[PDB]
Ligand binder design. Structure first.
Ligand SMILES: NS(=O)(=O)c1cc(-c2nc3ccccc3s2)cs1
Length: 276
């Protein structure tokens, strides 16, 4: 059963516990093991139905509850640490393409991830990217239980303003943040100190949304009127290594109003991926 696996090292933290690199004692296969709740039950329920090359594979469940996953050598945070500077623009494109393919697959099946960040993206030695950690995910946008939301830096303006409900638009904002991070050698786009600082960094770059751009903004549970910062002329200053077509895609992912954010399917059709 559980003792069939030898724990090798602690590799992470999920939404509900610790992740270990482990070895199957009978076969010597290397796996990622999560030992432990609603987050575990939800992850099993979703992953039994979400099979895609850009989604982490759930191999087995042992009953203590043990979840046996596919092993990847790094998460994107570790990948960035090892890159220690600019990523090759082709790797930037490949990793974004794969992330959007995985997200596209989820969204077409009415699943939003809700916890998209570099620690939840796995990178294997063949340059393949996988989405992991579906413990906060929602099916049909239905809340399962909770204040539990994605870490501050990847939170969209609607969520920062207290929206409790959202569509797959939540993941497209996080994808835009990760795209800027990929293009910037792992440097975060909006590394806010708290909610107020997060909203200020977002609006200072993109501009504070007008009534015309976002009519319902004023109705949000935690809405606060911010200074009307102008929309920065170009993203060339924040993503210097990203070409003009890349920056156009980035702008379409980073719309403050959730309804205006490009979908994963539309992003995959963007000219950025022309020669791919
Ligand atoms: N932090 S790290 O050592 O680069 C690293 C983390 C991982 C993870 N694998 C999985 C699999 C499933 C769920 C979460 C994680 S986190 C694989 S390598």
């Amino acid at each position: 059963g559980s003792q069939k696996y030898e724990k090798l090292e602690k590799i992470g933290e999920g939404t509900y516990g610790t992740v270990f690199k482990a070895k199957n004692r009978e076969t010597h296969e290397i796996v990622a093991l999560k030992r432990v709740p609603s987050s575990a039950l939800r992850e099993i329920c979703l992953l039994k139905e979400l099979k895609h090359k850009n989604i982490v594979r759930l191999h087995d469940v042992l009953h203590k509850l043990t979840l046996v996953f596919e092993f990847c050598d790094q998460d994107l945070k570790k990948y960035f640490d090892s890159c220690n500077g600019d990523l090759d623009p082709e790797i930037v494109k490949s990793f974004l393409f794969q992330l959007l393919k995985g997200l596209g697959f989820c969204h077409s099946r009415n699943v939003l991830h809700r916890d998209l960040k570099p620690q939840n993206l796995l990178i294997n030695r063949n340059g393949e990217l996988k989405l992991a950690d579906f413990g906060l995910a929602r099916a049909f946008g239905i809340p399962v239980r909770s204040a539990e939301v994605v870490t501050l830096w990847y939170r969209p303006p609607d969520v920062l303003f207290g929206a409790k409900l959202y569509s797959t638009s939540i993941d497209m904002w996080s994808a835009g943040c990760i795209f800027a991070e990929l293009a910037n050698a792992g440097r975060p786009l909006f590394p806010g100190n708290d909610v107020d600082d997060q909203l200020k960094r977002i609006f200072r770059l993109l501009g504070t949304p007008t009534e015309e751009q976002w009519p319902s903004m004023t109705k949000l549970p935690d809405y606060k009127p911010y200074p009307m910062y102008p929309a920065t002329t170009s993203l060339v200053n924040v993503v210097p290594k990203l070409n003009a077509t890349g920056r156009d895609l980035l702008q379409n992912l980073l719309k403050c109003n959730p309804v205006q954010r490009i979908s994963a399917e539309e992003a995959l059709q963007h000219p950025y991926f022309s020669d791919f």
